[PDB]
Structures are given as structure tokens and as C-alpha cells.
Design a protein around this ligand. Structure first.
Ligand SMILES: [Ca+2]
Lengths: 454, 473
């Protein structure tokens, strides 16, 4: 159990003419995908890219981005997926820290700004080059780093082939899988939600319908035209889908919702329109979701992330002791999808792992049936009169008020700390206080309110 | 390295889903966990401990499912015994497996094993009070979960990892949905039946369990319980065909065991709408390792299909890979392939080659990568030598009354003869040289008083070497 046949290679052998990828006006079969990825690997090799090297990728959602990721695997190269939305400065830090020798990008980015720290390669230019055929890496080592993905000083998450494989399988056991399934991705492939779908695609033999960005009209048209059954969304995406439909598209059986709990109004709308929304919890460190909540529980387990996927585990601890149901503590996770360690962060690794468990940095609790409730980041915790104040919970309450457009709460000095709130239309301190008192324990109610422009 | 115990986690995730339907009684995953934990507690009370080995001798019933899971929860290796085996065969496997216990019921004669093992009656056992224990919450992926004997029989060590990957790989191949229900009417002590129990807890899928195959009872069950998958052997399938005009409409997959099936069976299945997935695998692979979709059944006669995901097959002769349609030894590799035979280092050394397992069958691939299994006995060579062809030539000699040939390492053929009259090795060699390709000529000649044959009078070539004598020099 140390190595597997390269997923794309085996998938192309098993079902060569099934569709791997739909992008714009293009359909790519698994045979075509393997061929394109092998070709690109040959071209990279001609640019002196070698087994054991590290290559970064800076691209928008494109077919070529999918080729490049798979080409890296076929060469035995670690792929560093870079966030397009960061500053060049931040990008340079990750290039240095990751030890990347190469940057795979295109002319829509400022290539010259990177040419001093890595060999910068334009993918469109590269694909037109001649190159000698090579022998590809026909096996994936399960414990080898496949991708490196930075947190947000950022830490590089080492995601192994094993991690990605077990994420895909556990998700399949949770959601079910059939030959008719097709997954629509309109979020960035450099984030683990999008990236993981590429791996599900070759492992399941499942088509990915790839969009460069989210446009609700384009997505609805694509769902109907390309028989989409699954889709990953954030809340603003789900809100727009709901707004533009009379009912859920008949083919959609799973909407995988990231970005935390859905508000009750949104879930009630999903119920009426038949949107099968799976809420979830996960992170870069767990190679996408590790906990999910089925649609049938969405009303009765309001605010819950759900239960762990098969093979994965969660627990709640406080000072190294395990908590009772409903008792608050740090969320810790364990499973074959969980990262082994951060790249070159000895102290971070030492602090983050306890006996094969990863500490998430999140606080939460389990109910008597084992459903997870995520409360806030441990680091944002505010202590008032010995009681815990979770700013995120207070901010969420305030945000649910029609008019607050934005909200942040911080600890203010007092004699030990009290919550202050920093916030569409005018509203009195009295009205806000009444509102919060209904929804929050007395010590969590903001002592003072401030209105700002942003 | 480790996973949470599958039944424990399944009971935590979906407690109210139905795990087992047996004689129309329903058992939820939560109930299955409770029963298995209680049985484990009752077993510990009878001095069963982590690291022990316990044999199970039962017909299909809910209690047999409890017994397998109870063993896992105690950290006990489970030996699943073929109930059709004779008393002496059972005795051999109990001793060879290192079993300390035998879990059975009053339908078997437990007393005749008590000189080898402590015997436990499962029905008496389940009535008993017993102190609660802490179960083994984790399954070690590399640890032996079950021991299952081949047809000397060899004990196949099947790890938790093996069973897990077999289950996951089959799901990737066949698909899985919350509506699926899998009917099992063949023995749970065979790997096809046993593997359904692990699919059950890992997928969270209902198994409809029959004590035995009765065709009318199985048809009624398929209709009543909306069965979508079923495991069968050829005799089973033939009976289903005879009792229907069209396949029951809920069935989406009939997983047929035992390798490629005969054309007339396949043709009638197609006509009647039976979706037969052919397959090939073994105890050593923890169930199927290749499968063939129904739409290929008539067009790829003799094929068992393509490898499950993560799994590999190759055709080899003398370490050389074979071209398409070229015959060679079928060899397999994957996370579902067994650890090793238990306490049988000779068989391990003979069966494995650079990490691949030799199946002992010959086959070939077509152009599209589909595996065909040939219906033997032969030696290579590195060409082919049918011992029967060499034996036929030797037999035709006037001084030779009987001949047997087997492979030896000098890989060459050796001959074993019963003679009417004396004849020299030189003469026999030349006699063969005139009638046979040069790599088919026996390198050594032995003169025996008789040749070993089985009850059907077939020559047992594997026994010739040990019987060697009267070498012609
Ligand atoms: Ca003769």
C-alpha cells in the first residue's frame, strides 16, 4: 500500500472515451487529457524540469491549468498552486518558501516580475514547442507530496497523493457516485474545493464542467446543457442560484456548500425549491471537506457542520482533556485525508499535532448525537468576566439584522474585557441591544456600538 | 496505518439505516453494532483475548454476521470455515490456522474439535450476561482481519486494508447509491459473500441475507425488498433464468463469480434482460479484481474484463511481457491482494514475483486491454511444452508402456516411464528428437513401477518428481 498507478493514466486505460473535462466550447476525453498532460510534461522536461523539483502554477481556470497539474504528477514534480488574488509580493514569498524552481503561468499575468526567482514559462508558448518523448512516472507514491497549498506568515500545506485519494473516496462514500454524475466547478482551481474535483474526476471517471468564474446565467445554462448533477458553491453563489430559478434544476442532486453554516432563511428557501444543500466543514489541511451535513438534517441541526466522513474522526478537547457533549473546546481532526505536516515549519508542526491528531485552531462542540458545531477561531477568543465571547457568533447575530451591512467585534479593556461592535441604513443602539439580548447570553451583548464607513 | 472500526463508525454515522434483512427481520446498523459488541463481551467472558485466533463454523444467519464483527471488536483474527468440508479437512484447517477457539452452533458436532480448540455455541452465548469491555476502536490496515483457506489448502491472510480497498474499488467500478440493496444467498465463508458484509458497513448499504439459495424464495425477496445487486454463481443464475421470462426490474447488477461464463448462459441472460457482470478474482484478491460489463458478454467470449481502479494485471512468460493475444501467466497487483499465505513460506516464494501475485491461470489481453482466462497443464519453457504431447511420443515407443512428463530446473521437461523392456536414454532421446521440437525433448529419464493417478485415472504430474527413481544414465 505504498504506491498506486497514476490516476490519470489508469483512468485513460479504463474509460478512454468518457469525458474528463468540459470547458467553454471544448470537450476533453480522458484519453485526450492523458495525451495533453504527457505532451506538456515532455515540453516541461525540455525546459529542464526534473523529478523531485517544485513547480508553481499561476493560472485562471483553463483547460491548460488541468493539463499542468497532471503534467507535474507525470514528471514527479510537486505542484504549488498560487492564489491569483494575492499581491505579487505575497506570491514571491511563497515562491521562495516553497523552493519552486519554475513558474507555469501565462501572459495575462506579469511574467517579468517573477523571472528573477524562478524560470518562468508561458504555457501557451510551451504547448507549441517540440520536445522528445519521455518515460512518465507511472506510479504515484501515496506518502509523497502531490501539491503544496498555502494557508492565509502563510504555511505550505503538504498534500500527499494519499491525502487526495482518501478525500475523494470518503466523499464518494458520503455522497454516493454513479456514471451519470458530473461536477460543475466555478471556483478557483488553486483552492482545495476546486482542486479536489480534478482528482475526483480521474478517480471516479467523472466529468468536470469547468467555468472560469461564477456567472449565474452561464452556470444555469451549463447545468442544463451539460447534465450537471453536482456543484460546489459558496453562499453568494447559492443565493444567486435561488434568485434566478423557480425550482432546483432537475439534474442537480448535490450542492456542496462551503464557507460555514447557512442562515435559516437561506435553508428554508432551499427546502421549498428543492435545493439539496450539503453544508460542510474542512480546510486546506484536510484536503477539502472532512465533515458534512445532509439536506435532511439542515432544519433540525441548524448551524451544524455535520458528521465526519467515513474514515475520518473529530474530537473536542480542552487543556488536553476530552469534552462532554455540548462542552466547548478545540476541534481536532484525524484521518487519511489530513495533511502530514507543513513544509519547513518545525515549530508549527510540533504545536499543531498531538498523537496523530491535527489541531484546527477552531473552537466548537459536539451534540449528543455527534454532530459538530463550529463556533470561532481560538485566536479570536475574547474573555469577559471569565466567560467566553466568540466574536464570530456576535458578528453573525448582528449581520442577520436588516440594517447591519457589515460587523466586527473586538475586546475592549474593562475592569476584564467587554465586547465592542463596529458596524445599510440608520438603527439605534437601543434597537440593536434588544435584538442581541434575544439571541445572545448577556455577557456577549456589545457594551458599545460604533458606525463606520467600512 | 489505522481506521476507526467500520461497524462502529457506520453505526455512529447512519444508525437507523438497515444493515441486514434476514428472514424478513430487519437489523439496523446501530442494532448490528450493539449485538456484535455484546457478543464480543460474551466471548471475552469465555477467555477470548486480543491477538487470539477464532474459527467460525456457521451457516448463513444474522449470528454469523455478529460473530465476524465481534472478532474484529476484540482484535481477534477470524478463520471462516467451509461447512461442507469433511471432519478431517476441518481438523486440518483448525490446527494449521492456529485457532484457539471455534464459534459454532448445535447444528454442528463441536465435540469432535475440542481436542484442538475451545468450542463456543453462539446461541447459548448470546443469552449470557457479561461484563462490559472497551472494544478495539481501530482497525490496523496492515493487520490480518480474516484467514480463508484455498481449495494442502493454504490459509490466505486478508488484512483490513485488503478488505477496505476491495470494497472501495468495487464501488468505483459499479457505482453506489443510497437505494442499493445487495442480496447474498451464497456462503458467507466464501470471499464473495464475506466481502458483501464489509461493503455493507463501509457503504452503509443493506444486505439481504439468505440461508441458502432457493430460487422461488430469492425471487420473492428481490421483489419484496427491492434488491438492486446480487452475487451469483453459474448454477444460481441458470435457475433464475428457468423461473423467469424477464429479469426482475429492480436488479441493476448481477455479479457473477467464477471467471468467464459459457456462451449459451450469457446469451439467454442477455435475451431476458439479466445484467450480468462477469468477473475474475480469488480468495487471494479478496474478491473480484477484474469485471466485465454486460454489453461485452457475447462479443468478448472468455473475457473477465478490466482491472478495478488501483489494481493491475499483466500477462508474462519467463519474465517477458506478452503482446496482445499472446498467452502467459496471469499476474496481479493491488491493495486488495493478500499479505501472504499463513505459515507457508514455500507457497509465498512460489506465488509472488517482484511484488506481483501469480494467479496460477494462463490468459491473454486483447487490443483494448481486456483480460481473457484460458481453461493446463503446461510448462514454459520459455516456449510451450504440453507434457501430454511429449508423453504421447514416448508412449508410442515399442519399449514404453506408460509415460509422464513434468517440468524440472536444470526449466526443462523430465520424463517418467513405465517400461515393457529395457531401452537406453540415448535411444529415447533420439526417438523424441525426430518427433518433437528440440525444446520439448526430455533432459532426464526416470523408470518407475507405476505412475500416480487420481480417482478419475488422470495422471498427477505434480507428484512425479518426488517419486523419481531408476534414472537412465
Ligand atoms: Ca508403447
Amino acid at each position: 500500500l505504498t504506491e498506486q498507478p497514476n490516476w490519470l493514466m489508469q483512468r485513460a486505460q479504463l474509460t478512454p472515451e468518457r469525458i474528463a473535462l468540459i470547458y467553454e466550447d471544448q470537450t476533453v476525453t480522458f484519453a485526450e487529457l492523458f495525451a495533453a498532460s504527457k505532451r506538456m510534461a515532455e515540453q516541461l522536461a525540455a525546459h529542464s524540469v526534473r523529478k523531485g523539483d517544485t513547480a508553481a502554477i499561476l493560472l485562471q481556470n483553463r483547460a491548460e491549468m488541468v493539463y499542468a497539474v497532471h503534467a507535474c504528477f507525470l514528471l514527479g514534480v510537486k505542484a504549488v498552486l498560487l492564489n491569483t488574488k494575492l499581491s505579487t509580493h505575497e506570491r514571491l514569498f511563497q515562491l521562495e518558501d516553497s523552493g519552486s524552481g519554475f513558474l507555469l503561468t501565462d501572459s495575462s499575468f506579469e511574467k517579468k516580475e517573477y523571472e528573477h526567482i524562478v524560470q518562468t514559462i508561458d504555457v501557451d508558448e510551451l504547448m507549441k514547442e517540440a520536445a522528445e518523448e519521455i518515460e512518465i512516472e507511472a506510479y504515484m507514491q501515496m506518502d509523497a507530496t502531490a501539491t503544496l497549498m498555502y494557508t492565509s506568515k502563510p504555511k505550505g500545506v503538504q498534500q500527499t497523493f494519499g491525502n487526495h485519494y482518501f478525500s475523494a473516496v470518503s466523499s464518494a462514500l458520503n455522497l454516493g457516485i454513479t456514471e451519470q454524475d458530473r461536477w460543475l466547478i466555478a471556483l478557483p482551481l488553486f483552492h482545495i474545493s476546486g482542486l479536489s474535483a480534478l482528482f475526483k474526476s480521474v478517480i471516479y471517471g467523472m466529468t468536470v464542467v469547468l467555468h472560469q468564474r461564477f456567472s449565474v446565467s452561464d452556470v444555469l445554462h451549463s447545468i442544463n446543457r451539460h447534465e450537471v448533477t453536482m456543484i460546489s458553491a459558496v453562499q453568494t453563489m447559492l443565493a444567486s442560484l435561488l434568485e434566478e430559478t423557480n425550482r432546483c434544476p432537475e439534474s442537480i442532486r448535490c450542492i456542496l456548500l462551503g464557507g460555514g453554516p447557512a442562515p435559516l432563511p437561506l435553508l428554508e428557501e432551499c427546502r421549498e425549491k428543492g435545493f439539496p444543500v450539503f453544508q460542510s466543514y474542512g480546510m486546506t489541511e484536510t484536503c477539502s471537506q472532512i465533515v458534512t451535513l445532509s439536506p435532511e438534517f439542515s432544519m433540525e441541526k441548524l448551524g451544524s457542520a455535520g458528521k465526519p466522513l467515513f474514515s475520518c474522526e473529530i474530537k473536542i478537547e480542552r487543556d488536553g482533556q476530552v469534552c462532554e457533549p455540548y462542552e466547548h473546546g478545540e476541534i481536532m481532526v484525524k484521518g487519511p485525508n489530513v495533511m502530514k505536516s507543513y513544509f519547513n515549519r518545525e515549530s508549527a508542526n510540533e504545536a499543531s499535532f498531538q498523537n496523530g491528531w491535527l489541531k484546527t485552531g477552531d473552537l466548537g462542540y459536539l451534540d449528543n448525537e455527534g454532530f459538530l458545531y463550529v463556533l470561532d477561531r481560538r485566536s479570536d477568543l475574547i474573555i469577559s468576566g471569565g466567560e467566553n465571547i466568540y466574536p464570530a457568533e456576535v458578528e453573525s447575530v448582528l449581520l442577520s439584522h436588516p440594517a447591519a451591512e457589515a460587523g466586527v467585534s473586538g475586546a475592549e479593556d474593562k475592569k476584564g474585557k467587554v465586547p465592542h461592535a463596529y458596524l445599510h441604513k440608520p438603527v439605534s443602539a437601543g434597537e440593536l441591544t434588544d435584538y442581541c439580548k434575544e439571541r445572545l447570553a448577556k455577557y456577549k451583548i456589545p457594551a458599545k456600538f460604533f458606525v463606520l464607513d467600512r
